[PDB]
RNA sequence: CCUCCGCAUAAGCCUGCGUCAGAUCACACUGACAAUUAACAGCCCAAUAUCUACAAUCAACCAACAAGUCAUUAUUACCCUCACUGUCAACCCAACACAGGCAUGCUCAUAAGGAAAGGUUAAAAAAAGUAAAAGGAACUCGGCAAAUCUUACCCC
RNA sequence: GCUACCUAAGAACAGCUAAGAGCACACCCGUCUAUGUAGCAAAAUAGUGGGAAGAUUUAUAGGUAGAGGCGACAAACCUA
RNA sequence: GCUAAACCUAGCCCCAAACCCACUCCACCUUACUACCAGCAACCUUAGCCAAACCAUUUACAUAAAGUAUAGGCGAUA
């Protein structure tokens, strides 16, 4: 038997969304 | 005010609103659990 | 027994006797400093309290004094490569108390 | 896909080989090469 | 994987032109 | 970058196959088979365009009226949507009117 | 184990197996069949091709899933084992897999590699026979118990006096327990 | 006593306990029912001995000295329960002529599907049972659209399954 | 607020945690004071055979002989239950009058 | 040096700073192993009849109006006896190890529970405070803010 | 399950002066300024305030649904 | 020279032919995955976007006869 080490496991994590309409503001009437 | 805490949970209001007997007690609600059995949902209802 | 139909008892029917009992048990070492006479068993979920008292008085013939069970929950947080939760099975734990001070100590297996 | 393009790289290289002596991102990017190498000719 | 042979062949030949430039034979 | 490095495996094609040698055989079966058959009847494949060129719209209409009674539930909806779109497109859109 | 599982030289239950093939690899599978399978565990076979061709030797392991045999000590390459450190450890010759239809079966007295059929013999019934010569080549290739094994005497006693008496009753008859009370009928639906 | 939960004290840390040859069920079909009722209680006293060894070897992180005999005593258990089930089911066929010891009926649920509904052994007739009236065992015919839509889904999976294997056999015949 | 997780007794409020339980195969009932009444007749008693004076052991030897499988058919049991049914040249009609009913199954395991 | 908090219960969450091993602002994550023990709390009742005008407020005067939050009896039936479940945590809802939301009993300033400052320098501009000669609204849309307590009147 | 209104059975209102009374905690609301504007936050923080034994405030469960619900009408509110 | 790049095979799509599948144990209409007690029950034309350049009747859901007879703000179109 050839000796070895422990096992590991790693991945990523992603998500996305859309916040709101946006940005209340004002202008010239 | 602060407005992200719209889900104030309780198991009674979950089960008596979106539970299996709630989905089954209505003829218009059986087809919901049928659409989910058709799509193959791992969680049919709550 | 486990995973079976129980014949319903009405009022004056026969005593429900079991033969070829399905459930198996295991004795463990308690790690959080248990007293003498108190020995810890790992019980399948569908097994009541007196179904251990009659079980020990039947098969192993041990003077059981006081049984106390408790369901310890299984850890759900473990995710595969497909990122799905795998839940270790929860199980019952019995803290059997022995009579007459018979005082079982847990032996040193793998000495 | 049926009949997708395969030899894009040589069509890019034909343009870039006349713009190879440039400055900035004109010499490496294709979209900025044709807006200059056309003006070069 | 595109369905081609001619473009991959032209690339494989052009790489020979680049190898003879990077390390020419004596 | 799109261009593969290694050249793909070389394609062998044996042109003396059974199918590649017997292609075209038994065509012109009516004109020198004393007109027992028609070469539209050597056509094999779908049930509707067994010898009928048509359009895309014309093929969809014929496929509906020869098959659609036994077509699948989502597909019948998907073909009815297709004809409901193509009847709009061909008669109300495009150049030349 | 998953579908599309490449079978290495490791068994399916090794630490080396779960090094080489964790559950999330989906490599392209290998191609192969035909259950009249004539290469067995411990046969003496002759490698036709590769390196070290023309040699005859014993097959120590058959892996049916990739249609592999591995001959003993042959078609080899030298690997290192352990080495645990920046020192060499030990070198061991390790044997490559041999493809089926690369390797044939040798006649036991003619000592030539042949091909092998399955004719139904009158002796009963089907042993692998050689093509060119006749000479049926066989299927080739201390315990005494302890405290919790029975015997050979005690496993074949024929205790079964074979009556129609419903084991939960046959026990209770001889155990002496006397139930007087009667079971009342339950609405079974 | 409680000392039956471990073996004799000579085998603690041996890394192998030499005992094989589980009970194949041919060797139980010849034994009588009283012997089987005793042997079950033998095997149950042994499975606890091995299961203690399991959760203790997990505690002390050593391997099990003999893991291969856990499946052997399990093979004995499944042999014994199967042959007792053979005798029970044969005698039941002689006495009542029915298989399927728990009574039930082929029944249609709400969702059109034809299940085998096993009965639940109550103590009043079913026209008096307030829970059993609330279970509806019928079609209520709007579900037939979904019945068609799932019948076609099963067929689409079956069609993809067969058409994969024909293309696999063609590429194997174009390999050999 | 999970939909895939197993609804067990640990989840709901104090009127859900005592209501579900596990597969306990319960014993008695509740009487007028939240007073549990343990019916002894529903507690399963364990009919254990005495094992002192037994020959067999949990394993067999490897030296035991091999035999082909003998699926015990119902006719095969008839082939030994018919042994005194030839000298006339052992059966029960109904099961309601048995302590140990077979098809409306009355025993346990 | 803080404490505008803390400990419980309910609710929610479901092993989420226990032990060993590991790989990688700084070393609650991964793997394995252990655990929360009922007496607290749930989980309740055998019928069929028939019963129950005078509140609570320290209930005593005394005052009420908006008129109130608690109960049986008769006969029949009954002698099996203490199972099941919750019991962990630094946590819940806010996409976050998020100055927010969070019901109740205590604690009414604590016996709990905590750490505003990674280090240097002490420029601008900015923010939050402290102080100010003389003047005291002269600023400004307006005493807005800040400081201190107050005079009087319109309109709606 | 947020919110409008309602139903069931519940709960809290320190202290001081003497009643949809007054001062003032808890509590609830959000006047005004400042900070912040990809923020601590998809409406927040610090002061300053308004009511705080009632048309109060709030936990629990239940109901009313879009051609509608509900509304002390802001054409509000009904999962940002 | 790093980031990287390349890669056949998983499978799949279209048809043909052929009509398909429900009991290993226990649990699953109450809060589905709950051993265990005296009440009710299904059948109702689609509408509208769109075209008519608005919109208001109207507006498509083998081959050949044939886009023929007919219908239609006699028009869109059927
Ligand atoms: Mg606690
Ligand atoms: Mg947020
Ligand atoms: Mg402290
Ligand atoms: Mg700090
Ligand atoms: Mg500093
Ligand atoms: Mg700093
Ligand atoms: Mg001054
Ligand atoms: Mg001011
Ligand atoms: Mg007031
Ligand atoms: Mg408001
Ligand atoms: Mg006030
Ligand atoms: Mg209002
Ligand atoms: Mg208005
Ligand atoms: Mg229009
Ligand atoms: Mg237009």
JSON list of C-alpha atoms (C1' of nucleotides) and ligand atoms in Angstrom, two decimals, chain K residues 4-5 71-72, ligand 12:
[
{"chain": "K", "resi": 4, "resn": "A", "atom": "C1'", "xyz": [-56.85, 48.14, 5.95]},
{"chain": "K", "resi": 5, "resn": "C", "atom": "C1'", "xyz": [-60.96, 46.62, 8.87]},
{"chain": "K", "resi": 71, "resn": "G", "atom": "C1'", "xyz": [-60.98, 52.20, 3.91]},
{"chain": "K", "resi": 72, "resn": "A", "atom": "C1'", "xyz": [-61.81, 58.03, 10.59]},
{"chain": "M", "resi": 12, "resn": "LIG", "atom": "MG1", "xyz": [-57.73, 53.27, 10.01]}
]
